[PDB]
């Protein structure tokens, strides 16, 4: 349900070390938060999000702020 999403902004550049699972951010970039947990529902420092051009992937929680 899109109308329930949080959205976030990137506070730093992030170049993905595993670009198969992770998405890149440019400082200032907006995104939507899809999940805060890993795929199995467990706590995680890596958050799943959808980028400004519709890519899905994980990013570091400490590189963003939640609008």
């Amino acid at each position: 349900d899109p109308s329930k999403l949080e959205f976030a902004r990137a506070l730093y550049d992030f170049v993905p070390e595993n670009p198969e699972m992770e998405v890149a951010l440019k400082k200032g970039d907006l995104m939507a938060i899809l999940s805060k947990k890993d795929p199995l529902g467990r706590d995680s420092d890596w958050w799943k999000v959808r980028t400004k051009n519709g890519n899905i992937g994980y990013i570091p929680y400490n590189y963003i702020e939640i609008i």
Binding site: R9, L11, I67
Partner: peptide, 8 residues
């Protein structure tokens, strides 16, 4: 839905 700036 969203509103800030300024990353100087």
């Amino acid at each position: 839905e969203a509103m800030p700036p300024t990353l100087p």
